[PDB]
Structures are given as C-alpha cells and as structure tokens.
UniProtKB/Swiss-Prot annotation, chain B:
Quaternary structure and interacting proteins, as annotated: Homodimer. Interacts with DAPK3. Component of the precatalytic, catalytic and postcatalytic spliceosome complexes. Part of a spliceosomal 'core' complex consisting of CDC5L, PLRG1, SPF27, CCAP1, CCAP3 and CCAP6. Interacts with PLRG1, Lodestar/TTF2, and NIPP1/PPP1R8. Component of the minor spliceosome, which splices U12-type introns. Within this complex, interacts with SCNM1. Component of the PRP19-CDC5L splicing complex composed of a core complex comprising a homotetramer of PRPF19, CDC5L, PLRG1 and BCAS2, and at least three less stably associated proteins CTNNBL1, CWC15 and HSPA8.
Domain HTH myb-type: 1-49, 50-101
Function per UniProt: DNA-binding protein involved in cell cycle control. May act as a transcription activator. Plays a role in pre-mRNA splicing as core component of precatalytic, catalytic and postcatalytic spliceosomal complexes. Component of the PRP19-CDC5L complex that forms an integral part of the spliceosome and is required for activating pre-mRNA splicing. The PRP19-CDC5L complex may also play a role in the response to DNA damage (DDR). As a component of the minor spliceosome, involved in the splicing of U12-type introns in pre-mRNAs.
Encoding gene per record: CDC5L
Tissue-specific expression: Ubiquitously expressed in both fetal and adult tissues.
Ranges of the DNA-binding region feature: 24-47, 75-97
Name by which UniProt lists this protein: Cell division cycle 5-like protein
First-to-last residue of the parent protein present: 8 to 110 of 802
Swiss-Prot record, chain D:
Subcellular location: Nucleus; Nucleus speckle
Gene Ontology BP annotations: chromatin remodeling; mRNA splicing, via spliceosome; positive regulation of transcription by RNA polymerase I; positive regulation of transcription by RNA polymerase II; positive regulation of transcription by RNA polymerase III; RNA splicing; RNA splicing, via transesterification reactions; spliceosomal complex assembly
Name of this chain's protein: Splicing factor 3B subunit 1
PTM sites of type N6-acetyllysine: K86, K94
Subunit-level organization: Component of the 17S U2 SnRNP complex, a ribonucleoprotein complex that contains small nuclear RNA (snRNA) U2 and a number of specific proteins. Part of the SF3B subcomplex of the 17S U2 SnRNP complex. SF3B associates with the splicing subcomplex SF3A and a 12S RNA unit to form the U2 small nuclear ribonucleoproteins complex (U2 snRNP). Within the SF3B complex, interacts directly (via HEAT domain) with SF3B3, SF3B5, SF3B6 and (via HEAT domain) with PHF5A. The SF3B subcomplex interacts with U2AF2. Identified in the spliceosome C complex.
Entry GO MF terms: mRNA binding; RNA binding; splicing factor binding
Superkingdom field: Eukaryota
Protein family membership: Belongs to the SF3B1 family.
Name of the gene: SF3B1
Swiss-Prot record, chain E:
Tissue expression from the record: Ubiquitous.
Underlying gene: SF3A3
Function, in words: Component of the 17S U2 SnRNP complex of the spliceosome, a large ribonucleoprotein complex that removes introns from transcribed pre-mRNAs. The 17S U2 SnRNP complex (1) directly participates in early spliceosome assembly and (2) mediates recognition of the intron branch site during pre-mRNA splicing by promoting the selection of the pre-mRNA branch-site adenosine, the nucleophile for the first step of splicing.
Protein name per UniProt: Splicing factor 3A subunit 3
Species this chain originates from: Homo sapiens
Zinc finger residue ranges, Matrin-type: 15-46
Cellular location(s): Nucleus speckle; Nucleus
Domain of life, per lineage: Eukaryota
Swiss-Prot record, chain F:
Protein name: PHD finger-like domain-containing protein 5A
Gene Ontology CC: nuclear matrix; nuclear speck; nucleoplasm; nucleus; precatalytic spliceosome; spliceosomal complex; U12-type spliceosomal complex; U2 snRNP
Family to which this protein belongs: Belongs to the PHF5 family.
Interaction with SF3B3: region residues: 78-81
Residues found modified as N-acetylalanine: A1
Protein source organism: Homo sapiens (Human)
Keyword field contains Transcription: yes
GO molecular function: DNA binding; RNA binding; zinc ion binding
Length: 183, 103, 49, 836, 48, 100
RNA sequence: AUGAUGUCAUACUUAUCC
RNA sequence: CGCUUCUCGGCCUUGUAGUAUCUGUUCAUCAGUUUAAUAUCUGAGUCCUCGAGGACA
C-alpha cells in the first residue's frame, strides 16, 4: 500500500529532495511536487528531535547580546555602567541621540526568506567558497607580502592544481589588482 | 531551617579542613544558608571526624542504661562520658531502648 | 570548570549545566565526571600516552 | 500527613506497615487520596496531578470505591468536599466509556450539591454533572435515572429533576424530548408526572433564554397537567409555564396560546397557593400579549390582584408583588386608575417591617415601587415614603433610601416641588447621621439625590457641610471615612454653585488630616482630595501644590490597600496635569520611592503606578528614569519585574524611543539572564505600544532577536517570539517584510516543543508573521510537513496549516502547487490553464 | 553489553548497498552514507 | 488568557447588546488582555445579556460600569470578528480565595 | 559522546489570587 | 652510579497551574500490537538427580 523510497525517487524528476519519512505520508506525489518548488522553504529539523529545539544550549555561555555602533557612539552604555556601579543623572545630549537614530543609522544584516533558523546556527559560519586566487586580508598580514601570493611562485614549478583544474592565477596563464591573484 | 544537605555538608567539611576549627565566622561566609553558630553546631554534631555514627553495641547500651537512672536529666553531660558525644544519638538510643522493652 | 553567571549564580563549563547555588557547583566536583570524558580530547590532542 | 481520629476507619489499611508482597497494591497506593484530603498545599497539588495521570491506569472502579465513602463522610469539611469534587472532575475529563457502571453511583452523592446554600457549590455541581452526562451516553443517563422518578422520598425526585435539567443542557432538548413527553403522559401514578413537570421547570431556569426553539413542543407536553385531578401537578405545572414565559423573551406568545383560557378560568375558582401560582404564570405572560387583548384580560386580573393584597402568605406577597410590577408597568395601563385603586392599599399592606427584614422581599419591593414611580410619576411615591426616612430601624431606612435613589435616578428631580424637597434634604441628612454599618446605599443615595437636584440644592449647603465637618470628627474609625467619601461625591456640587469659602474649608481642613494614622480613613481623605482636584483647577488650589505634593510623598510607605490606591491616584492626577509646580529633585525622589510600590498584590495599584511613572517621565525626560528602571534587581520571578518592563515601554513612548533604544539594546549585554529576557519583554511591549513607528527600528532589533531567538534558554525563544509577533502586527503593509522573513528563518525551528507557553507563544508569532509576510511564504514553509506520517510533524504542521487556513482562506487559492492526477482522480485544476 | 545504546544508535539493522561492491550495512544511516562514498563512487566509475 | 488558562469563552452569536466592563477590570482587553490601543467595541450575545445577565462585565463578570472594547492588535489579527467572548466557566480562580 | 527514566533542590511564566 | 646538608635563582598566600537545567540513578529468542526509533500482551524430544548437570536418538 506504500511505495518504497527507490520507486519514489525514480518516479520523481528531482530525487535530491526526497527523505525517508516522506514514504509514510498519504500522498507522496503531491509532497514531492511541493518539496521541489522554486521558492519553497523546508520544514524545521525538530520534527524528529526530542529536545523541543531549545534544550540543546545547556552549557553554552556565550555573549548574551551585542549593541550596535549607533548606540555605542552615544555614550549611554558608559553612563549606564557608571550608574550601575554607583548603585551597586548623566544628561549628555538630546540632539546627539536623534542624530545617531536618524543620520548615523546603520542598516543591520538581515537574512534571506529561505534562511530559516537552524538548531545551533552559530558554529557553521559558512560563507560562499573563498577558493584559489582569492584570500582574506589578515592572512595576508600573517603572510606579510606588500601589495602574486608567494606559493603561486611554486604553482609555477609543480603545475596547476589537480583539485581546481580550471584554475588561472596571475602572471602564469592569467595575465590582477588588489587582493585577488587568481580566478 | 538547617536542612543539612549533602552538598552543603561537603562544603562545610572542606571549610573546616581548609580554614580551621576556632574560626566560625570565616566558615559561615562561604555557605549562604546558615549562620556561624549553626555551622559550628553542625561541625560539632555530624561533621566531626571523631563522631561514631554507627556500631551500636551492647556494652554502650548497658553503659547508657546504667547512667540514665543515676542522672535522669542532663543528657548532654552523659554525651561524652558514654562515648557517643553527638547529643542526639543518646536520646534516640534511649527512645529505642524504651520502645523495644515496652512491646 | 567553575564559571560565574551575570545574575549571581554559577555555571559548569565541563558539565555544561547550571548551578542554582554555590553548593550546587561545589557538589558537581566529585560528581558530574566530565573529567573522565576529557580522555577522548586528550587522545585527539596527543596520540601518545 | 496527619489522620483525624475518625478518618482512621477509612485509612486504617495504610496504617499497617506490611509492604511489598496486585489490585491490593493499587488500593494501597491509592491512599494518595489522603495526601489530597489532608496535608500541605504542595502535597495536595502534586498528589492531584499524580492521580490525574494515573486515571487510565487505575480505572474508575477502584477510585470511586475508595472516594465515594469519603465524599459521603458525615464529618466532611467544606474544603475537603470541594477538593474531592475537583478530583472527580479532573479524572472525569479523561475517563469516558469507563464510568458507565458508576454513573448513578456518582449522582447519588452529587445531586445533593445542586440543592445547597453555597452558590459556588451549585455551579460546580452543575458543571460536574454536565461533564458526567456528556461524558457518559444519553441512554446511559436515561436508563440509569428512571427508578428515582417514582422514589418515595420527594427529595431525590427534586434533585433528580435538576439533574435532568443539567443533562438536558448537556445533550440538548430535542434528544431528550421523547423521554419527557413519555413521562408526563405516564398513567401509573401522579408523582412521576409531578417530577417530569418539575424537570420542565428546572430546564426552563437552567437553559433560560435558549429554550426558544422547542418552546412549542414543551408547552404541548405540559398543557395536559393543568386540568389533572391531582393538585400538585396543576400547581407545579402552571409554575413551569411561568418559568417558561419568564425565559420567553417578548415572543412565542401564541405557543402559550392554548394554555390561557383554562388559566383565566382557574383564576376565578381557586383558594390557596395554586391561585398565587397561576397569578405568577399569568403575571409573566401579560407582557407577551397584545395591548388590546391584554387590555381586557389585564383589567380582569386587576380585581383579584387588588383583593389579594391582604393575605398573610409571603409566597403570595412575592407573587402578587412581581405581578403588580408587570401588570401595572404595562404601557397600556392608565395612571389615574392606579393612583386611586392601587397606591393606598399598596403602601398600606406592602410597606411594613415584616418585608424589609427579608432579602428577596426587600429587593422585589424596591423594583416594583421603582416601576410604579416610572408610571404615576415621581413626587407621588417619594412624597409618600419620605416620612419614613426618619423611622427608627436601619434596614427600613436603607430600603426607602435606595428606593428614592433609583427613583430620582430615572425620573429626574425636576418633578419635585419645594416643601417635599425640604423634607428630602432633611430626611437624607438625618438618616445619614445615624449609620450602624458601613455601606454604599446611603452614600450613593445622597450623591445621586444631590446631583439630581442640581443647583436647587444651593440653599442647603451650609447645613450639609456643617454636618460634614462635625461628623468629620465624631469617630474617625467608623465615620471619618464616610464623611470623607461624602465630600468626595459632593465635590462638583460644592464647585459649580461657586461657594469658594467651602473650597477653602475642605481644602485646608482635609489637608490637615493627611497625618491620620488610621489607613481606612486616610484613604477616604485622599479620595476626597482627588475629587476636589477634578473640580477646582491646579493654580486655584487653596492648598497650593507646593504645599500638598511633598506632604503626600512620604505616605507611599503606608502598605494599606486603600491609602496606596487613592494616594498613587492623586499623585497621578497632579503629576499629569500641572507638574510644573514641583521642582525636579522632589520628582526623582518620588521615583526612587515609586520603585518598590511594584510589590503591590493588587493590579490597579501597579496600573496607576506605571501610568504616573510615564507622566513624570514626561515631566523630566527619558534617560535618567529609564536608567533607574534598568537598575532593577529582577529579584522576583513571579512578575514583580515585568511591570518595570511596562514602565520601560511607556517611558519609551512618552518621549520618542527614537532616543531611548541604544541604552536598552546595550543593556542586553549583561550576563545576568533574567534581565536579558526582561529587556526582551521591553521590546515586546515596546512595539505593542508604538505600532506604526516600528517601520524603522525593526532593523535595529533584528540582529539582537537573532541572538536571543537563537536559544540560550527557552524563555529567550518565547519572549523574543512575542516580540516578533507584536512587531509583525505593527509594521504591516509598509514594505519591510524582507528582514521579517530573515527573522522567520530563526523563528522556524522552535515549532517543536511540548511547553505550553512556548508553543502558544510560537503560535501567536507565526500568526502575526502570517499576516505581515503574507500567506504564500508561510505555506511554502508549511507544505512538506503535512505529509509526514510520524505522530509529530503531521500534528504540528497541520496545526500551523490550520492556523494559516482559517484566516485568508480566500487568498490561498493561487499558492496551492501543481499536483499530478492519479488513476481514479483528476488532481489538476485546468481552469487556471485556460489561455486566451 | 550496550544493548540499549546499540538499539538507540541503530545497530544490527539489515541493510545492503549493491552499488558499493555489494557491501552490507548495519544501519539505515550507514547504508545512506555508504551509497555516497569513495568505494561506491569508485565502483560506479569502474562500472562505467 | 495569561491569568486564567482554563477559562472558556462563550463564542455565541453576536447580537445588538454592547458589552460592558467592571470597575475592577476597566481598560483590560478581552482577547489580547492589554491596556493600550482600543479600536473596536465589544458586542455581547443575546442569551448572555438578558434580565440579570445584562449590564455585567464580560471578563470580570461583576457589575459593569464602563463599556468594554477590544485591542487594536486583536482587531488587526481578526481576533475580534469571532463570537461573543463571555466568560461562562469559572475554574481554578476565586474558589479557594473565598475560604480565606 | 548526546538520549533514557527516576529521588531531589533551583529559577522562570501565567498582569494567577485574599 | 646513589644519597644528606648549605647556598643562588625561575616563583602559586505565603495560596494554586506548568516548565528545565543541576546532582544520585541504570539501560530469555522467533512473530505481530505499539513507538520517531525504542519497551511490550501472547510463543518454545525423552528419562534421572538437585534453571543447571549426565545419558540416548
């Protein structure tokens, strides 16, 4: 009465989204069509868990919260800390707070419509895929080269990398400005 | 108050071993549940290392039976003489000897 | 493993649990054997004994 | 926990210490009852839950076997009774098919709850019989309860009738009709029919207004008893008609139709109680007839109504009383006829000291007299009853006093002439000067009289206020509070007539009593001051605010429920209105004193407190006072904190939050957790109050919600989610949806949990997010979860999908994806694929 | 003998991957990870 | 609500009787149970307001003085277009407080 | 190395309530 | 190659409802019920001796 997962994956045009719990549904064809939509979002990962999505962060004691630059550039945090130290007033300004709230307003980092909150969502700070020919600033500092990164001197001798065959890096077969020395 | 939990008893034993014996105010500033007199009473009653909390024999029962008639009151005077020195095990043993011999 | 909270409480880092009073963190020393679970991290940090 | 010396008989099995060796161990462990009966409140709580979850385990048999004796105990308490009632409820929310053998075995103990002096006992009883009947089956109830109909004792018959009333409210009238309609035609014996008719009545009382649809069938049942040879059946019958018509709101008159012609005839020939009963029925009927037919019929009833005033029966007097209300309160009745025929005997026989001492007779008398005033006019009634204000007894004076009160409330004082008005004011003062008990009736009475008289009262003031001051001494404990309140309610009258000397008097005189040590007095004093502030303005206060307010400031320690109330109120009025007269230093001191007023056990105290704190927040400006809020230790878990949070909200409103937010958002940094969730709440209420203005600050709060919604501990996810809710309703339609989608990501994993507050929180969250984002995105998160046969994901995603489904069901159409058609069914909707 | 730990982890479960050189798996997650592995991809590349 | 979670509403048919609030429960909302942003008035059912049931509070059930209103957050969330929210049941509230 | 249950404190919520 | 003393230096003195994280606690073989996966009711050569041992097929 219930089809197997291989028969459901062979019949579906997009078999990279089928799960093991979708065979126990009442209509796998409609679920497979709805799961393969263009702008659809998946369900949360707490459907099979037993921690109720809030009991996993028991021993994690990180920073409770961080204030923005528009609030830190007003001097209210230091005055509040001085008042808390005196209790355990300021009257700095009235137009500077309005200027920090209107003119010096910083747009926060929002998220995508499909960017749902994961369980941990703090130890997986993934970011695109900084590949061959493109590096971050600081690691430039450790490397200490003034404005090729010097092991692309040895990418001369030993050859183009097996891992990224399509590679071009400056000065060799790739005829470079700022950070990015290969594409 | 004075529930005398096991985690508080271990902290009181560590404070008696680390700070000292004749400093009750120094031991009461690291528990946040009892006063200095209650901590000293607990250290002299249950947290003392010389307290014989077990091994009730017939020689001690005969010693306590031959002492409760000579002195009916003042059980604290017969605490160190009998050898229990807990000031509550003597009354409990007297109650057990009075209940078992009554039937 | 003893860590202080921002409200006057203790929190165990190795046991990854909360402590209500000062006696609670002082009773997770003999107990809460997270020290025996550090042998895997010690073997991962150093392959030799 | 301890055993009373009698309860041993029940709990003896627990006393023996033999232990650890089947059913005998279930009865033995069932003594947790004892923990419910006697013990500490926590033992009762935990025990109660433990036995709730063991219902399905132990079964109804052992429980009731071990309970019904206790609830049957001759020594039973009040509380213990009520508690056993609670356990019976809570176990009967679960057990359904199981209770069938025990239903009667339950009701026998429970039916005595329906007839009781305690009201709460009665509403409980009706509730648990509702749960039992609905819990069991109809046929279970019916087949159960028959033999109690013909039972010799009438007690069980009666309480059984109310039982059928309750079960009929449960399972509805039409289901139970054929049973009844069969009963009232039973030819065996009369007692049955008497019972069934009583059942008709108690159904009338219980269901009340909702009888309406089946009224016809019910009447068609009952009608055959009016002519029966037995008397009771006739009496209780017509009574049941009465109850019907009384629940029969101005309609279904023709349904009673065929009933009338016998009744009227009976009106002639009857002696005794049955007569009065008919008068009750007809009485409630007449308002439902036509003023033409009811003209004749009424004019016939008036005769007997007159003749029957004089009977010593108090049942009689109740009936004929309410009758006189309905008959003579008819728009189709002529004044002069009442004025002549009725009023003199009415005030003769009915106004006497037998009546007033009773309760129901008191009330009903008040009402009837009020209506007679409503027709014949004011000066008549009042003019006849004024002389009784000076009568000795209290309760009688109280009666005529509240009567005058309601009368002058409705008709207005304009009708009253001069002399009778002198007798009025003197009467009211005189009666007011002797007060045996403390009560509103005399006070509200006086106030309404004066405010109704308007400025016709002006010549009488000096006598009034002379009495007010002299009484304002006499006895502080008893009468101080009362004379004070008298001032409070007479303020406006002492104002508009422009007697300024009197305002000087009350101002400084009352000013002097603020050192009174008795709280119950002082409260009334502050109240009086309040009322005086609302008439004479700020700058004209005879005790200039510079004097007054700092004199008020120290009183806030007073603990007292009335002092704190009125005090905080007045500090609110002055702090809101003038607010300049007092220097800022005084104000900030007021703040640091206000901070601990939030320990109040009363909600209105905190109310006025927070609103004041907002007012003075306007008087000064935000930063300092919101810092003083952030000083808070949070020390109390059960509330006592979140009121400060509310102050943070309202403070953030009073001057633009456009200023305040950075301080707060910085103060989330602090490692102390409970204040972290505190400032989360502050954001919640904050957006709830700001509404539209959040079109900007959304961004500012967004990353912090990210940090909070990412879970340190559940309360973070909960409160933050509430913030997402109120933000989501507030920002609607302004085009910020993007960041709300981002936050919805982090919201989404929290869907799964059993904690009630976090799951209902998340529900509110996703509902607000539904309206703000639009359904399409929601549904795109809710599709795949439907399918899941796992006993969890489907439960939840279907709960969500329902929440999304009920609202905006109209707009969902476009977003259902394409679903291919199988063999037997065509799942493609081709209408959308028609192309021009 | 960790019987409950092996039952909760999913051990002693009948599973086999014919693409990964007809190997057997002691669990469904192990069968899912063995279908996309180095040996399974090597056998798929050697099969063509 | 947040104070009483076991209380059930009436949810009957909406009539023409305007709802009222008691002096102890003045300003509190019926659904949202808030004190700010009143947008829509409260309407009572026909059976819920008849004779002695008229002029009573919806939430408190005591003597109503001022007319009750619904919150704007409940109005925008379409929580005010439901049935008459008259408090019919009264459980685990004001029962043991009468004994003390 | 999560999770399991159970004796047992500790915080938190419900504007909980005389 | 081992051991004792002495010196110098690197240095540590209230009434009710519900929730979790702490800490003690531990996780006889087929078939189906159930459960996310877990547990479960029911199922299984002769003789002798006190589940075990021996003998025979």
């Amino acid at each position: 009465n219930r089809f197997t997962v291989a028969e459901l994956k062979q019949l579906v045009a997009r078999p990279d989204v089928v799960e093991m719990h979708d065979v126990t549904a009442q209509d796998p064809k409609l679920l497979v069509h709805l799961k393969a939509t263009r702008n659809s979002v998946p369900v949360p990962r707490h459907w099979c868990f037993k921690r109720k999505y809030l009991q996993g962060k028991r021993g994690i004691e990180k920073p409770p919260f961080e204030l923005p630059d528009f609030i830190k550039r007003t001097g209210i945090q230091e005055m509040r800390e001085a008042l808390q130290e005196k209790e355990e007033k300021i009257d700095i300004d009235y137009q500077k707070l309005h200027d920090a709230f209107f003119k010096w307003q910083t747009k926060p980092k929002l998220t995508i419509h499909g960017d749902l909150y994961y369980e941990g969502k703090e130890f997986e700070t993934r970011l695109k895929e900084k590949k061959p020919g493109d590096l971050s600033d600081e690691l430039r500092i450790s490397l200490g080269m003034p404005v090729p990164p010097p092991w692309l001197i040895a990418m001369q001798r030993y050859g183009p990398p097996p891992s990224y065959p399509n590679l071009k890096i400056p000065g060799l077969n790739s005829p470079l400005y700022g950070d990015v020395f290969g594409t | 108050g004075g529930v005398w939990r096991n985690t508080e008893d271990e902290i009181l034993k560590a404070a008696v071993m680390k700070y000292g014996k004749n400093q009750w105010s120094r031991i009461a500033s690291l528990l946040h549940r009892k006063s200095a007199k209650q901590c000293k009473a607990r250290w002299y009653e249950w947290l003392d290392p010389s307290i014989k909390k077990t091994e009730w024999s017939r020689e001690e029962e005969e010693k306590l039976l031959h002492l409760a008639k000579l002195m009916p009151t003042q059980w604290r005077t017969i605490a160190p003489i009998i050898g229990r020195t807990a000031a509550q095990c003597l009354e409990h043993y007297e109650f057990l000897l009075d209940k078992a011999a009554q039937r | 493993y003893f860590m202080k909270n921002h409200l006057g409480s203790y929190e165990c880092k190795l046991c990854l649990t909360l402590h209500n009073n000062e006696g609670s963190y002082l009773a997770h020393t003999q107990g809460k054997k997270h020290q025996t679970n550090l042998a895997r991290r010690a073997a991962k940090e150093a392959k030799e004994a | 926990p301890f055993l009373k010396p009698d309860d041993i008989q029940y709990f003896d099995k627990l006393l023996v210490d033999v232990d650890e060796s089947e059913e005998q161990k279930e009865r033995k462990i069932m003594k947790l009852l004892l923990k419910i009966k006697n013990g500490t409140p926590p033992m009762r709580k935990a025990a109660l839950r433990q036995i709730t979850d063991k219902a399905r385990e132990f079964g109804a048999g052992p429980l009731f076997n071990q309970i019904l004796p206790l609830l049957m105990s001759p020594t039973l308490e009040d509380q213990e009774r009520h508690l056993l009632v609670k356990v019976i409820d809570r176990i009967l929310y679960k057990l359904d098919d199981l209770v069938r053998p025990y239903v009667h075995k339950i009701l026998v103990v429970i039916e005595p709850l329906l007839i009781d002096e305690d009201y709460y006992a009665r509403v409980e009883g009706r509730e648990i019989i509702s749960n039992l009947a609905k819990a069991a089956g109809l046929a279970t109830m019916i087949s159960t309860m028959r033999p109690d109909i013909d039972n010799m004792d009438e007690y069980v018959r009666n309480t059984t009738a109310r039982a059928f009333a309750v079960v009929a409210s449960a399972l509805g009238i039409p289901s139970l009709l054929p049973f009844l309609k069969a009963v009232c035609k039973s030819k065996k014996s009369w007692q049955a029919r008497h019972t069934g008719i009583k059942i008709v009545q108690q159904i009338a009382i219980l269901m009340g207004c909702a009888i309406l649809p089946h009224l016809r069938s019910l009447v068609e049942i009952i009608e055959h008893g009016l002519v029966d040879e037995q008397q009771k059946v006739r009496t209780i019958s017509a009574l049941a008609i009465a109850a019907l018509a009384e629940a029969a709101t101005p309609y279904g008159i023709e349904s009673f139709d065929s009933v009338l012609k016998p009744l009227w005839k009976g009106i002639r020939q009857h002696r005794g109680k049955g007569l009065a009963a008919f008068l009750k029925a007809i009485g409630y009927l007449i308002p439902l007839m036509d003023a033409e037919y009811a003209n004749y019929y009424t004019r016939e009833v008036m005769l007997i109504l007159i003749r029957e005033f004089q009977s010593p029966d108090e049942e009689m007097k109740k009936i004929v009383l309410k009758v006189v209300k309905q008959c003579c309160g008819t728009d189709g009745v002529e004044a002069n006829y009442i004025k002549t025929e009725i009023l003199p005997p009415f005030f003769k026989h009915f106004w006497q000291h037998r009546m007033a001492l009773d309760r129901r007779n008191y009330r009903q008398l008040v009402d009837t007299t009020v209506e007679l005033a409503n027709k014949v006019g004011a000066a008549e009634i009042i003019s006849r009853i004024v002389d009784d204000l000076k009568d000795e007894a209290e309760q009688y004076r109280k009666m005529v006093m509240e009567t005058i009160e309601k009368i002058m409330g409705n008709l207005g004082a304009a009708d009253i002439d001069h002399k009778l008005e002198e007798q009025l004011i003197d009467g009211i003062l005189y009666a007011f000067q002797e007060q045996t008990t403390e009560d509103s009736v005399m006070l509200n009475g006086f106030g309404t009289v004066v405010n109704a008289l308007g400025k016709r009262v002006k010549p009488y003031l000096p006598q009034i206020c002379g009495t007010v001051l002299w009484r304002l001494n006499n006895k502080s404990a008893k009468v101080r509070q009362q004379a004070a309140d008298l001032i409070s309610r007479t303020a406006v009258v002492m104002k508009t007539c422009q007697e300024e000397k009197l305002m000087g008097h009350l101002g400084v005189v009352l000013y002097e009593y603020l050192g009174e040590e008795y709280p119950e007095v002082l409260g009334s004093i502050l109240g009086a001051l309040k009322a005086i502030v609302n008439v004479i303005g700020m700058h004209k206060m005879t005790p200039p605010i510079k004097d007054l307010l700092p004199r008020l400031t120290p009183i806030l320690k007073n603990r007292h429920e009335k002092v704190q109330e009125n005090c905080i109120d007045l500090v609110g009025r002055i702090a809101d209105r003038g607010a300049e007269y007092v220097s800022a230093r005084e104000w900030m001191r007021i703040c640091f004193e206000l901070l601990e007023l939030l320990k109040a056990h009363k909600k209105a105290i905190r109310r006025a407190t927070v609103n004041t704190f907002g007012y003075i927040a306007k008087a000064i400006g935000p930063h300092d006072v919101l810092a003083t809020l952030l000083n808070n230790l949070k020390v109390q878990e059960r509330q006592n904190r979140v009121c400060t949070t509310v102050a943070i909200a309202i403070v953030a409103e009073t001057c633009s939050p456009f200023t305040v937010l950075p301080a707060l958002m910085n103060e989330y940094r602090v490692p102390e957790l409970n204040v972290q969730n505190g400032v989360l709440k502050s954001l919640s209420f904050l957006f709830e109050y700001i509404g539209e203005m959040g079109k900007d600050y959304i961004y500012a709060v967004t990353p912090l919600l990210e940090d909070a919604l990412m879970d340190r501990d559940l309360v973070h996810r909960q409160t933050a989610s509430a913030v997402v809710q109120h933000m989501s309703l507030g920002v609607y339609g302004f085009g910020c949806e993007d960041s709300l989608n981002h936050l919805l990501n982090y919201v989404w994993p929290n869907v799964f949990e059993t904690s009630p507050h976090v799951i209902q929180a998340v529900m509110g969250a996703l509902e607000g997010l539904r309206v703000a984002i639009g359904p399409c995105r929601m549904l795109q998160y809710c599709l795949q979860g439907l399918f899941h046969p796992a006993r969890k994901v489907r439960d939840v995603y279907w709960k969500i999908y329902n929440s999304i489904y009920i609202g905006s069901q109209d707009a969902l159409i476009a977003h259902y994806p394409r679903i291919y058609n199988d063999d037997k069914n065509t799942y493609i909707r081709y209408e959308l694929d028609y192309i021009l | 003998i960790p019987y409950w730990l092996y039952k909760l982890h999913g051990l002693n479960i009948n599973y086999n991957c014919e693409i990964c050189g007809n190997y057997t798996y002691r669990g469904p997650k192990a069968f899912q990870r063995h279908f996309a592995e180095w040996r399974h991809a090597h056998g798929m590349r050697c099969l063509g | 609500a947040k104070h009483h979670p076991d209380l059930i509403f009436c949810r009957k048919q909406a009539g023409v009787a305007i709802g009222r609030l008691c002096e102890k429960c003045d300003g509190k909302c019926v659904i949202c149970d808030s004190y700010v942003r009143p947008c829509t008035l409260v309407r009572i059912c026909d059976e819920c307001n008849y004779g002695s049931y008229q002029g009573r509070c919806v939430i408190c059930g005591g003597p109503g003085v001022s007319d009750a209103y619904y919150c704007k957050e409940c109005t925008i969330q379409e929580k005010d277009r439901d049935g008459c929210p008259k408090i019919v049941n009264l459980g685990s509230s004001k029962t043991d407080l009468f004994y003390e």
